[PDB]
């Protein structure tokens, strides 16, 4: 057993490994979305920039969980990073909707993780999740909701003008 | 002249001090390491083997040179690509390190369908139609050539082959491998005339579809894009899947090219003291795609050590073989015993009057657990007596442990150099090895090295030593005894077994107006012919080389008289009605007849009546050929 | 067909997609290596920092290839990112040896890509590979070779002192 | 000799087809050698040794048969003898196909001829090799 | 074999060693030319400065090739540096003409090297030669051609005034 390990349940260790994979998966989804908007037949550069930034943030989320695993004396176990569900994201609106769904899925996973940490009476892990993840998810979900709303109200996805102007004014 | 007991001892004690692993290691050095047929390194080894024969002081050593068309991969890479039917954008999955000789050079795009080993049965058991699709199959069970044919037979447009981890527990999943898909042996592009000008091939046995070998990694990446779990019956990786997703299909590009090469068959001979014009032939494959330690090195090593030993026994120890012993180092074995077949083809119908036995030394050492043998029934007795006094290298017990081993013997297959000898030339042949229930995984890869070999088999020297003793005892018995150790009586069991099978349809032969009476009479006549021959041998004066010559010549012709006289060797080279391929073999006759229980139109009553006739005629002819003088009937 | 596409063979397009996956795979290998050295029972912080930097460089390599795909009018097709071959990298020396092997594999893939580009007479793609990848690989391979040599000469992996001092002097 | 002598009356037409007759000449030479060696062997044999005579006589007994073409099925064409049988595999057929090359009519069959040339050469070589005796004597 | 070596033919390795010698030879030629102009009976200080700079540039060219040899896992093999063909360079014009001839010879060697690299399908080496050597040679040859032309037009070598003024205006 690790010389540093204390009050860290094997179930929590495993759940942290699963969360690491999910964060890496989210990074990959956003990477794919970003370059879709870089296609010459899509060509929305600020959508591309926005999603690339989101991708990099998810890699940071994964790295912090890997750090946590080692801090607590658990052992990192990695698995394949699955390719994103879609190759062609259809429109700015559809990509935003997919991102919203993704962030809500990630949030649900984090809430399940917190429930486990609570069940195993691991207040350090609870605080870690609350501090570094839970409000970040709430903010991300709210932002994506706001974006989806604006795109719908502007007339997306049918209006190419709507996505163009949103790209300039909201994401620019 | 020495006593069999002394020859046995001499052989054994020479073997005791023989260093096999050194030679196998030596053949794995960079001067020879990658020795594809016709390459300079192959040519180097050819020169080395030839020099060694000269140092052994064999009666004569010579070259049998041939120019042949093989296929090698092009400067342009073969590729396996996944296509999105949506927009038709492609993704490169692999540029395989290996390739499959004789693949059609072509580019094909379709759905991908798994068909297990691509056996005839595997295809019928498919709930997914292969037609118009590319097929992927695991290596093993049958040759690449058969897999391609079976698939081509169902209108597949291409074939991928990988080594699954269950059948090939190889750690490196990126390993690429080689083989060929020519459904025969020899050069497939053999125009009977020189040409600039281009003539079509005809009955060549060549694939009309692209076929390509891929790494397990590439296969699993393909599985990543497929659906449907594989039947647990296949006993394969959980990775495996059956069909591409709706939106995806695979594209295969093979651009292999034809290259003419100069191969060398290297021959040594120890001349016989009584009938030198008759020989036992001992051969091994010298070429390999990669290092080919097990594929090529073992065999070539045994070839060299056997040649040396027998030369010493003749010159120092007084051994005096009645008939000649020829040692043969073949090239282009990896392409379908091409070297061996080219030489055989110079003597289509005459060779069986000189060569009375071929012993193949290829892949004689692959494991430790088992001793396997495939051969003409004419050698079962020799093989048995030999196993009865050769010991297992690990175990210490005699190889002979099953009184019933002969009925469980599997027949020579197409990938064995022993095959064309028996089935095309009518020369009794034998291949054998120490092995497991598992294929040697590294065959046809760059991992077939000495180091790999010496690692899975640390007793390599002892095992190679046991392999040399069986081959050596074969060779001594065969050139020492005044009779030929060809047990012609064995074909009574074979004919019996065959008629016994056929008689399971004595009803269906009624509903066709046919009697089997003339066939029974042929079988009876063969029995009589062998009985008379045994009596003649017994009544002969073993010291009268004239009468023995006459009786031995009759024995030497048994095998050949089972080659069907009613089929051209060009259209179907494998004429042996027991062991060859085609509609003229006894097995074919049975399969056509088994297709009569189904009321489906697969049965071919007409064909059967011809098969029945030709079989009867062939068998009668053999019986008549054995009976001796025309006034004895 | 893309309005921008010109002299860009479908085979090259596919090969670029395969290279994108390989770059992402390399990023993942280095990420795994990095956090191995962050374990409390390994504890070589400069090995961890070195490999984390290498991981981020590989993500940049992947992104540039995704940009190239779009520049030429090809379409990005992503596949799963396979987990690294190892979970426990054993020692600083062994990790360096694995990295060396990885970079040589990546180089071989790039050389095959260049051969394809040459065969299809795509000088823009040839120049892209030469400019942005080939010398970077040669430099990376040389650096890893140098590192392996020093660790061996110092007495690694047996000498924990060797890896400790290498961590401070070469990677610090 | 007679047959090649006839064939040599087209050493020109064999040029315009990119073909050498060299391997056929060599087969003829090899048969000559094989017979010469056999005559010598007979002379050097002890006429009272029925074993050596048997061996030499058996070689003589096989000469005729080795001129049956091994490359045609006896069912499709029973008369396989390249000198005396019937079909496209006989030496005469090879000549007749070639005589049809002076007429610019489409009767000539260049492809067939290249096969005929090949099969003839192979048949003749095979017979020469079948007569030479022990494989170490060449 | 070197742990770093990959796709680097023994012929290329040897050719790089020959090129190293040639670069060092060029450095020596220019060193000799420089000090000729420093003689009290020649006394053209800017010719001397110009050629000394060229000499130092050639040493840099040699060093970069030595670096390349090691980068690719080849082994440096040095040979004697031959003395320059001349001791007395006669005039400013004649020295410029000799330099022009030298740079064209060096260029030919580099083109032969590139042909070899191309024949051995070594795109890294091709790019190295193109990037660091081929245009430098074209620029050097053009500059020396320009210099020779001006000296001829001004009346050199007969006009000591021409070489004097060229020394001040072009090389000063």
In short:
The structure is cut from a larger assembly and holds three copies of chain A (172 residues) and two copies of chain B. Chain A has 172 residues and is mainly alpha-helical.
Structure description:
The structure is cut from a larger assembly and holds three copies of chain A (172 residues) and two copies of chain B. With 172 residues, chain A is mostly helical. Chain A has five helices and no strands. Chain A has one domain: Ferritin, core subunit, four-helix bundle (Ferritin). Chain A has helices at residues 10-36, 45-72, 92-119, 123-154, 160-169. Chain A starts with 9 loop residues before the first helix and ends with a helix. Chain B has three domains: 1-74 and 257-490, Aminopeptidase; 77-254, 3-Layer(bba) Sandwich (Glucose Oxidase, domain 1), CATH 3.50.30.30; 491-632, Up-down Bundle (Transcription Elongation Factor S-II, Chain A), CATH 1.20.930. Helix content of chain B is 34%, strand content 18%. Chain B has 17 helices and 19 strands. In chain B, helix 7 (293-315) crosses helix 12, helix 8 packs parallel to helix 10 (418-425) and helix 14 (517-539) runs parallel beside helix 17. Classes of the chains: A mainly alpha (172), B alpha/beta (633). The interface between B and D is large, with 38 and 35 residues. Chains A, C, E: One of its GO terms (biological process) is negative regulation of fibroblast proliferation. Chains A, C, E: Fe cation 1 binds at residues 23, 58, 61.
């Amino acid at each position: 057993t690790s010389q540093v390990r204390q009050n860290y349940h094997q179930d929590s260790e495993a759940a942290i490994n699963r969360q690491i994979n999910l964060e890496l998966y989210a990074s990959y989804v956003y990477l794919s979305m970003s370059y879709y908007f870089d296609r010459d037949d899509v060509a929305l550069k600020n959508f591309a920039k926005y999603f690339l930034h989101q991708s990099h943030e998810e890699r940071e989320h994964a790295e912090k969980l890997m750090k946590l695993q080692n801090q607590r004396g658990g052992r990192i176990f990695l698995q394949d990073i699955k390719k994103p569900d879609c190759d062609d994201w259809e429109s700015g609106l559809n990509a935003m909707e997919c991102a919203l769904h993704l962030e809500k899925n990630v949030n649900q996973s984090l809430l399940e993780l917190h429930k486990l940490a609570t069940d195993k009476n691991d207040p350090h892990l609870c605080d870690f999740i609350e501090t570094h993840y839970l409000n970040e998810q709430v903010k991300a979900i709210k932002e994506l909701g706001d974006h989806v709303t604006n795109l719908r109200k502007m007339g997306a996805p049918e209006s190419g003008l709507a996505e163009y102007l949103f790209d300039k004014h909201t994401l620019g | 002249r020495l006593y069999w007991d002394d020859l046995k001892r001499k052989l054994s004690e020479k073997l005791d001090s023989t260093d096999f692993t050194s030679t196998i290691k030596l053949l794995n050095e960079n001067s020879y390491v990658p020795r594809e047929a016709g390459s300079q390194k192959d040519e180097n080894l050819a020169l080395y083997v030839e020099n060694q024969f000269r140092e052994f002081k064999l009666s004569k050593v010579w070259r049998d040179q041939h120019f042949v068309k093989i296929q090698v991969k092009d400067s342009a890479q073969n590729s396996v690509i996944i296509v999105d039917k949506n927009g038709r954008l492609v993704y490169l999955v692999e540029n395989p390190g290996g390739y499959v000789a004789y693949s059609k050079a072509a580019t094909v795009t379709g759905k991908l369908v798994h068909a297990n080993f691509g056996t005839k049965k595997d295809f019928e058991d498919l709930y997914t139609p292969v037609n118009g699709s590319i097929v992927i199959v695991r290596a093993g069970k049958i040759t690449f050539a058969e897999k391609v044919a079976n698939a081509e037979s169902l209108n597949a447009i291409g074939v991928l082959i990988y080594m699954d981890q269950t059948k090939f527990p190889i750690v490196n999943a990126e390993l690429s491998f080689f083989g060929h898909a020519h459904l025969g042996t020899g050069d497939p592009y053999t125009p009977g005339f020189p040409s600039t000008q281009f003539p079509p091939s005809r009955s060549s046995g060549l694939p009309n579809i692209p076929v390509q070998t891929i790494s397990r990694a590439a296969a699993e990446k393909l599985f990543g894009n497929m659906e449907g779990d594989c039947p647990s019956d296949w006993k394969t990786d959980s990775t495996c899947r059956m069909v591409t997703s709706e939106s995806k299909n695979v594209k295969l590009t093979v651009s292999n090219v034809l290259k003419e090469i100069k191969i060398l068959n290297i021959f040594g001979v120890i001349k016989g003291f009584v009938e030198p014009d008759h020989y036992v032939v001992v051969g091994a494959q010298r070429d390999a795609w990669g290092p080919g330690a097990a594929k090529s090195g073992v065999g070539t090593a045994l070839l060299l050590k056997l040649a040396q030993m027998f030369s010493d026994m003749v010159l120092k120890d007084g051994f005096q073989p009645s008939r000649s012993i020829i040692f043969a180092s073949w090239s282009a074995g990896d392409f379908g015993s091409v070297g061996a077949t080219e030489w055989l083809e110079g003597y289509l119908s005459s060779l069986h009057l000189k060569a009375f036995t071929y012993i193949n030394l290829d892949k004689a050492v692959l494991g430790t657990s088992n001793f396997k043998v495939s051969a003409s029934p004419l050698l079962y007795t020799l093989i048995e007596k030999t196993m009865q006094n050769v010991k297992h290298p690990v175990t210490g017990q005699f190889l002979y442990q099953d009184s019933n081993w002969a009925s469980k013997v599997e027949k020579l297959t197409l990938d064995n150099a022993a095959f064309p000898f028996l089935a095309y030339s009518g020369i009794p042949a034998v291949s054998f090895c120490f092995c497991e229930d598992t294929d040697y995984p590294y065959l046809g890869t760059t991992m077939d090295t000495y180091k790999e070999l010496i690692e899975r088999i640390p007793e390599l020297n002892k095992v190679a030593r046991a392999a040399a003793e069986v081959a050596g005892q074969f060779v001594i018995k065969l050139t020492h005894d005044v009779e030929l150790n060809l047990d012609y009586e064995r074909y009574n069991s074979q004919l019996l077994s065959f008629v016994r099978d056929l008689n399971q349809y004595r009803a269906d032969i009624k509903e066709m107006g046919l009697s089997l009476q003339w066939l029974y009479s042929a079988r009876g006549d063969f029995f009589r012919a062998t009985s008379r021959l045994t009596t003649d041998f017994g009544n002969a004066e073993k010291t009268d080389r004239f009468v023995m010559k006459k009786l031995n010549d009759r024995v030497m012709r048994v095998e050949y008289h089972f080659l069907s006289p009613y089929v051209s060797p060009k259209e179907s080279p494998f004429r042996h009605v027991f062991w060859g391929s085609g509609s003229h073999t006894l097995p074919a006759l049975l399969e056509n007849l088994k297709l009569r229980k189904q009321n489906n139109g697969a049965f071919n009553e007409t064909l059967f009546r011809n098969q029945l006739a030709l079989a009867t005629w062939t068998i009668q002819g053999a019986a008549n050929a054995l009976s001796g003088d025309v006034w004895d009937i």
